[PDB]
């Protein structure tokens, strides 16, 4: 089966609901395995000395009519993050494109720099195709996504903090 993982989100400390994501283990298993493990925290601590775990991390960059970005559990601002394999890992395959809201894809700093940061598209983003590895999609709680999207701004700054209060695997 393709794994399903979840985030229980808060916005300004207030519960916002659950996002459930299906991960395309069938297509991009190495990328999926990283994300799945970062939802459970099972692999221990990274090079940063922080837990390899999304729990407690935030969506630090949210841009309406584009995407929600999170996963920087080491610096909280887009300058950190790391994978269960080490700081960075290769782009596995570009077999899926950024075709619809709810697509889940890896943020990076150029080719072969995947860590832990990810984004959820809120529009089709074809200009990202070939540059970011798509590895899953939101299957429930897209409303929670759209509610987070509204707290964002053009600068990416959020009006209230958007936190993955809890996370794990179903």
């Amino acid at each position: 089966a393709n794994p399903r993982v979840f985030f229980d989100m808060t916005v300004g400390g207030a519960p916002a609901g659950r996002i459930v994501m299906e991960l395309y283990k069938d297509a991009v298993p190495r990328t999926v395995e990283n994300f799945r493990a970062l939802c459970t925290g099972e692999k221990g601590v990274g090079k940063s000395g922080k837990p390899l775990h999304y729990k407690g991390s935030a969506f630090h960059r949210v841009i309406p009519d584009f995407m929600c970005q999170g996963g920087d559990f080491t610096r909280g601002n887009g300058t950190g993050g790391e994978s269960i394999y080490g700081e960075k890992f290769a782009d596995e395959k570009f077999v899926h494109k950024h075709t619809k809201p709810g697509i889940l894809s890896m943020a990076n700093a150029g080719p072969n720099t995947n860590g832990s940061q990810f984004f959820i598209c809120t529009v089709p983003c074809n200009w990202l195709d070939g540059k970011h590895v798509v590895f899953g999609e939101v299957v429930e709680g897209m409303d929670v996504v759209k509610n987070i999207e509204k707290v964002g701004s053009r600068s990416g700054t959020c009006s209230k903090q958007v936190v993955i209060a809890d996370c794990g695997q179903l």
């Binding site: 887009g78 894809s105 990076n108 940061q117 990202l128 990416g156």
Partner: peptide
């Protein structure tokens, strides 16, 4: 522009 980078956010 509209990118998703991790440390130097560009146009």
């Amino acid at each position: 522009x509209l990118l998703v980078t991790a440390g130097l956010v560009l146009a």
